[PDB]
Amino acid sequence: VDKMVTCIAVGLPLLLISLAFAQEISIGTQISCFSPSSFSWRQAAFVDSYCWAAVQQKGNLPLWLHKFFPYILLLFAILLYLPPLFWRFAAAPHICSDLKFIMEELDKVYNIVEQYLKTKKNSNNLIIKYISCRLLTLIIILLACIYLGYYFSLSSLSDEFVCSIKSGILRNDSTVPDQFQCKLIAVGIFQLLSVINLVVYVLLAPVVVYTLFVPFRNDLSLYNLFLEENISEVKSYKCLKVLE
Amino acid sequence: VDKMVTCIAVGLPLLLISLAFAQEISIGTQISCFSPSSFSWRQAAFVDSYCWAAVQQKGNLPLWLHKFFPYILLLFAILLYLPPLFWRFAAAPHICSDLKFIMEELDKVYNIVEQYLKTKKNSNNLIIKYISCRLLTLIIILLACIYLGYYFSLSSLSDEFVCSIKSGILRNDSTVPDQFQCKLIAVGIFQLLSVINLVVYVLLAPVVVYTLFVPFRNDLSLYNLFLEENISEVKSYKCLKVLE
Amino acid sequence: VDKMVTCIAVGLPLLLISLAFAQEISIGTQISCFSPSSFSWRQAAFVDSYCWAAVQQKGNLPLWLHKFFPYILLLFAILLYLPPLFWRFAAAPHICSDLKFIMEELDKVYNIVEQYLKTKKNSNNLIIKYISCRLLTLIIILLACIYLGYYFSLSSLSDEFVCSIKSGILRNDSTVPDQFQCKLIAVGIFQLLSVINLVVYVLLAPVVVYTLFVPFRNDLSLYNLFLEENISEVKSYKCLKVLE
Amino acid sequence: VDKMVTCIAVGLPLLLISLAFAQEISIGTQISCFSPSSFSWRQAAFVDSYCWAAVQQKGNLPLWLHKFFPYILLLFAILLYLPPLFWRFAAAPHICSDLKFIMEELDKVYNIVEQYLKTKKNSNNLIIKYISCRLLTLIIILLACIYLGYYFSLSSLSDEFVCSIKSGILRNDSTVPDQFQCKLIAVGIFQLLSVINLVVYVLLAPVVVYTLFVPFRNDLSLYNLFLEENISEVKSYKCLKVLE
Amino acid sequence: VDKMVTCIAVGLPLLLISLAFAQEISIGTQISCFSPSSFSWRQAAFVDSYCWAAVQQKGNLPLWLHKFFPYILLLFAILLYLPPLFWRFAAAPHICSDLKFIMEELDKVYNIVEQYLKTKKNSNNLIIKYISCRLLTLIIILLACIYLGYYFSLSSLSDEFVCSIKSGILRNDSTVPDQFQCKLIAVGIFQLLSVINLVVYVLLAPVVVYTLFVPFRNDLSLYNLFLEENISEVKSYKCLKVLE
Amino acid sequence: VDKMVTCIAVGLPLLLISLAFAQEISIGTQISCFSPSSFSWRQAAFVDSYCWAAVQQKGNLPLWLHKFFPYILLLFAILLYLPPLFWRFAAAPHICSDLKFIMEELDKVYNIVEQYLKTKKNSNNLIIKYISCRLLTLIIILLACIYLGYYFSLSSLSDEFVCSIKSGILRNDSTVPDQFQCKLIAVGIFQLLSVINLVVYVLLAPVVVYTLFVPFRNDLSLYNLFLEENISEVKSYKCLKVLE
Amino acid sequence: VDKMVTCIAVGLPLLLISLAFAQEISIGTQISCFSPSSFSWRQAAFVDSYCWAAVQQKGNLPLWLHKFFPYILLLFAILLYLPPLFWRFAAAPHICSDLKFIMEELDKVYNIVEQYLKTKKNSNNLIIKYISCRLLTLIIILLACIYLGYYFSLSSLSDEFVCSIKSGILRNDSTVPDQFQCKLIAVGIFQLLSVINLVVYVLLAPVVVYTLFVPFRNDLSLYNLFLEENISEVKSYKCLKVLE
């Protein structure tokens, strides 16, 4: 119930990037500048190479984002991978054996543990590790959500821009016409990828805060709720009840 | 009998998409605009890049669908994968052990369970999980069915459209002829893929509602019907009868 | 003897399709229209893209089949896969254990089963499942056989056709010459693939109906014939006889 | 000694086909027609596409074979695979256990079988299955041998032929020069592949008929000769002799 | 806690290089020189081949780094791999058995080791191997950090440079215009890769020196801290305490 | 000591062929004819296709070898594979058990075999199988050695030759200039591959004849020398001696 | 400690070659000759094919090395693989059992070997096999080191050379301009690969001679030093000491 959130919050940005690259290769380069009819095949591939590199040199913040939208979406994916990567390396040895301990000792009682819960309750160290692995996960969803909302928010006739190559010794020339109407290509594919990654991230925002309500769902309030999720040995206690 | 429906309702849209891409690569780009004879090789590849991106900017709803038909068909495939993905994570631990429990205890009787069914009958919690995993599956087939029917319903001379590139600084020019008869290419392959995915989805519509008739097929009406499907231990009870 | 038929009736159409695609890639596009000498490299690739898409818009039934011959051959392959896919999911648990049952109980007799066959004989439920898995297999071979015969039956100078692109705003022009002699390319490879898939399917037509003669080959007439095919425990009964 | 023949009679045609395709891709298309200097890049690729398809429409039998030489060599490879595929599905269960039977019972004699051979001798059913799996293998080598000899027998200036494209509406024109000297390319690679597949198939022709001399090599004449080939339990009988 | 640092300090430079090459292939060559309109397709590919090779022959140190930025980033990755490669080949046999030794002998005490720690404390040979495997790791991070900071520090209009090909017999000619404004392409992708590899390496600099504080975290100060990390047998000593 | 010769006499020709193909693809076609400036792109690819096929039609023996040098080197590789392929199928069952026989019986003597060697000595059947598997291997090295020496022996300005295409209806024309200076490309790579495959095959020629001196190294002279190579049970007889 | 040297002395030349080929493919052919503007696309690809083959025909020794630098680096890699390949086939059976022999017999002493070392000391046969496997390894590093130093030593404007194609019937012509300024491309990548393979091979030269000091590190001087490297049974002798 909690591993499924951190697999569709990471796997879904990975799926859209791989689908974007099969669309990126099957059409061509992400820029396409309208070179004049006088240029050759190589000079017309110079302008598509210059203008794709010169979107950063001087709003300008809309144009800079379209180049790196697969990268920022990638960085927001591996940064959701690290709280589960740190959960398996910090709080996994402290939880694997102690669930095995209660799983074996409850067999011999029906064939101590009542004073186990009285002293494991007052320990505010492992519930703090649990919420900080999910509160950091919650805000990094919303930072990814506000970026995905901002990228869709522009949505304008903004992929079209005007660049020029007359910078170096090409300045003060008589062949280049000083203006090149370029246009980014993959914007419309990215605008739809910025929506279906936003609606999912909005629909998972009540679910991730539903895990932050473990009394309604101290350390006993954490520990009593984990035993019926990944441990099938509690299901034999219902076999005690159904016979009577 | 129920895993076979959710494998051919998901595997069949996956098969058509992979066959479409081998047809998409082996011919070329999905758009092909008739550029003039005056244009170069690069300006003629500008118009195929502009017009393929400018189908969304202003019926228009036929033309927008042809670009994203592999994507909408993909989204309708993974959304049929989630009710079985949630079935293996919610109702699978509550059903694996209790079928193992009756599978072992019925051996020692011929070598209790009669009062097991009297109290497992009045429990309207796990039949509700069963129908909601299939009723949500039923309507999401019909929403996929009505989209596939609507895409085939247009079928017109609608792939041909007229676009223009005179928008930015290319506006007020004297070389571009203001109109470009473009045409989408993969429409005829998609119209046949929208039929053989519709006839299958119509032919599976009585089957998925046939699973929604579990009395004619409460919790006992659910639980008595599962034991002769994935459990071979009931076949020894016929070995009790055939000897007598 | 019966798994070998449903592997060469499915594997043989799969082998011809994979061999066709290596021939399809190594030559080029399946259409090749004779564009005029006045056209550019891109306008000449427009006509090959328009005419390959416009074979369906208005005999015409010969020309429509040549585009989709790998698809119809593919659909006739997976539709032969489903009666064995349903045999392993419906009649496989009802037959795996009961063959194991006689395989063990006949050991202890020489170290009941004589009254086993007297009551398993009068059961017309599992022989009906056996013939319907093969009678449906028989007619779907003949429907595939009559399509393969019809595709070879045309064999004419029919790949050559005449198309025109003057439809949209390209209508009422003065550059396009109103007629384009196109020709499909992979027809001659497909005509030979339609023969060696027909001669095999004719030669397997007496074999598949030879399985439909199980008395000369009720439920006892089905059940007595399966035990000497996939079960090596009957071979020890000959070791009983050869010692005497 | 007999599995090695049916692996180099099948693996050797598979090896030459894979080596031919790496030579076929690394050079180009198998046809190369000398288009005029007036034609464009696309019209010159029309003639290479028309003439490669129009070798069948009206000696002509030399030219038709050069297109399908990888296919006929492939069909002669899988048709040598079927007598071993039928040997493992028909005569393999009748021979696996009975060799295991003598392999175990001869241990306890030195720790019946003398009357085993007196009644297994007069059985003309399994030697008939053995020779028909090899006599059918023998003639299908010679049919492959006479085709490989006939293909090498032409060896002429026969790849060069003259084709014309003036058939449809291209007939009665004033631009096409009515004759196109084409030439197949991979003929010289195929002529050498038709020799080293002929010398091997001639050198294996005495070996395959050497297996057809099982008295000099009834059912006892078959059965006594198999026990010292795939069965290492006969080697302990020499350990009986070497101690004495 | 220490294997996670040496996997994200090595895996993160490996991830950026693989992402850079998919961006390097999908656009084109890293150089793009503006050849004149008079040149052919091959002479214009000469200048892109000459100028990409002639960045080293005579500041110049900015231009030389842009060619080899994937190589220097690769060399700084495998040089972080060698202190863990030497740790598993030098100090791994001296630590695998002795942790197994205390793991077994502490079972039989509750079912010597108190004098074990009194003589294993005064041994300054294995703590010296531990710090030198991490102090060498610390400075090689900072040398990688100062290079990544220096590469981002230039960030100028420095990818644009001017080269000339008039060197050999091409000197004293009348066709080449003596100057070619070239421009490297992947600089802007590399400038962003030089930032997200710098912020991570700064944020890991307090963590790697936090491992260099093993008293606050002699040989006993090393050995007492390893037993509760990779060894689950110490968790049973808490099972001694929780029962009392 | 003898498996290492037949792995570097087979693996080394396989390694050079795979390295040749990566050089063959990365440059282009093996022929490159200097077509005139008047020809188009397709007619200039006709001459490279005609002349590459017409090296066999009429010294001429130098030019024919350069086309098929990867094939003749391949045929000399699989022909060194067959004496080890026949050794594992003819003399392997007669040698696996009898080495296992002495390996077990010598344990119980120290816990018959002295009369074993007196009768296994006079058997001139299995030493004859041993030398003929290596004498046939020896001469097939020298035939491969003399071909590799002859190919390097030409080494001339012999890749350059003159071909003409005026054969069929292209004869009696007025456009083709009757002579085409072609040149094979991969000759210089092949001349170096013909040296490092010759120096190895010369340096292995004393080693393969060193195996043909088994008295200085009858059947006892063969059998006594095999027991200390692949059998570790003879090493315990030194443990008998080192204790005394 | 000695397997790590022969894995980074072999794996490091393998890594640079694979990185060179990804740079070789992503740019183009290793030669790039400045063909005139009059030549076609095919004649300009003739000169790049002629001049790349004609670097050997007549300092000249610098130019010949640049073609075969990946091959000579490959030959120096597999020649470091053969002393470990011969170590596992000659001195591995004589060392696997005798280390197992002392590993078992020392258990029963604490639960002969003192006279084992007195007679295994005076045996100068297996130490001679040890040094010759490493002395041959030492000089073949230095021969690889002096070649790598010599290749970096040239480093000049030496990739640029002048070739001509007027050799055969192309001699005495009036179109070719008699001189072609070519230039090798991958030289600058190879000059950096010749440095980082030299600094490693210099830094491993004291390590490989450190293995040649086995008294300071006869047969006892060899045999006493191997037991604490790959054998964990000596670590129990410290468990004898730490208890006392």
Residue numbers in the entry:
A (entry chain F), B (entry chain C), C (entry chain E), D (entry chain D), E (entry chain A), F (entry chain B), ...: 34 to 91, 99 to 151, 195 to 300, 326 to 352
Cite, word for word, the article reporting this structure.
Pannexin 1 (PANX1) plays extensive physiological roles across diverse fields of biology, including cell death, inflammation, cancer progression, and neurological disorders. As suggested by biochemical analysis, PANX1 forms an oligomeric channel for the facilitated diffusion of ions and large molecules across the plasma membrane upon activation. The overall structure of human PANX1 presents a novel heptameric assembly, which is distinct from gap junction channels (connexins and innexins)8,9 and functionally related channels, such as CALHM and LRRC8. Interestingly, the protomer of PANX1 shares a similar fold of four transmembrane helices with the aforementioned channels.
Caspase 3-mediated cleavage of the cytoplasmic CT tail irreversibly activates PANX1 and triggers the release of the “find-me” signaling molecule for dying cell clearance. Cleavage at the S2 site is essential for the activation of PANX1.1 We generated CT-cleaved PANX1, named PANX1ΔCT, via Drosophila effector caspase (drICE) cleavage. As shown by SDS-PAGE, PANX1ΔCT was partially cleaved by drICE at the S1 site, and this result is consistent with caspase 3 cleavage. However, the dramatically deferred monodisperse peak of PANX1ΔCT observed by gel filtration (~1–1.5 mL) indicated that PANX1ΔCT underwent a large conformational change or that reasonable disorder regions were removed. 3 pA, whereas incorporation of PANX1ΔCT resulted in the channel opening up to 177 pA under +100 mV. We therefore collected the cryo-EM dataset for PANX1ΔCT and solved its structure at 3.1 Å resolution following a similar image processing strategy as the full-length dataset. Surprisingly, the two structures revealed almost identical conformations except that the density of the intracellular region of PANX1ΔCT was weaker. Interestingly, the channel gating was observed in PANX1ΔCT, which indicated PANX1ΔCT was highly dynamic under the condition of electrophysiological study. However, it is still not sufficient to stabilize PANX1ΔCT in a distinct conformation under the condition of cryo-EM sample preparation.
